């Protein structure tokens, strides 16, 4: 319970599975440099929920960008360097609080999300 996602949950009220066209779907962080803005989404084990983790961190830190696994969908920004994002790591709820999902400006809004 010492490890968590930096971002809030994305509850899925609809029946349609979550999807994102290329580029969109990456929450924005002012602390993050344009190189660091690269990671994945993991479906919450136990409605389904999705958590964003940076590349090389989180429950699937060992997966390289582009792997196929059910529950894992990959997103990345432009100019994002392919490195382990160890300098961001994950979130400790004891020392830091969860950050509201920071969607980019005028992004896609699939069914069920307002």
């Amino acid at each position, epitope marked *: 319970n010492n490890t968590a996602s930096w971002f809030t949950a994305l509850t899925q009220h609809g029946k349609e599975d979550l999807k994102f066209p*290329r580029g969109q779907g990456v929450p924005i962080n002012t602390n993050s440099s344009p190189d660091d803005q690269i990671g994945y989404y993991r479906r919450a084990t136990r409605s389904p929920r999705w958590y964003f983790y940076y590349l090389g961190t989180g429950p699937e830190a060992g997966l390289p960008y*582009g792997a*196929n696994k059910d529950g894992i969908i990959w997103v*990345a*920004t*432009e*100019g994002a*360097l*392919n490195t382990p994002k160890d300098h961001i790591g994950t979130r400790n709820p004891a020392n830091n609080a969860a950050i509201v999902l920071q969607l980019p400006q005028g992004t896609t809004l699939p069914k069920g999300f307002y």
Partner: T-cell receptor
Amino acid sequence: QVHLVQSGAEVKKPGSSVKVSCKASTFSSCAISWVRQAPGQGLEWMGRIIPILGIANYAQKFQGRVTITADKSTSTAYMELSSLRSEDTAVYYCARGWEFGSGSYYRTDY
Amino acid sequence: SALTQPASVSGSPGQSITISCTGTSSDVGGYNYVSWYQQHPGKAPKLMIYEVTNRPSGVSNRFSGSRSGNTASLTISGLQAEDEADYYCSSYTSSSLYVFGTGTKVAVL
């Protein structure tokens, strides 16, 4: 648009070698591959090369007699196939690609 | 590894058909780098699909890609006689290589 020219047709005898070229009309971090196709048969991938790095990966079926090399200064890449035999009669292609691997991203939509 | 493809494919022109491309867990169902190529008889291969679904610019939306399990499927819609050519699938491997399919030749009635 970037197009590729090669070395002309060749007619060699078994036991000798062959060195084909592949010139591009970007030779930075470019995955250059050579593919084969026996007449009436399917495609068969053979090798890869990143020129500025020099690391070349080969398919295990061809690992041992084919060799891929790059000339980054001239923007040309060579391929050296030795120990030629009858079953190696086929049409040989070259192609330029891109691979992310451990480099920086570009919205170039590579 | 090995990539299994249907040898031949055909249908009434103007219609659509799904062409399969099967492999193992570490070449098609492990990575998202499945590709598709067209090769006219006598002409060099040409690209229509680079990522599993992504289509390069200058290619009509009549071509679209998809993947299920370890079996990707190419779906040509509104097939014309101008598409008469070979169709091959390729994908990245955990061995950091490329593997092609056995080949699917086409014919329009």
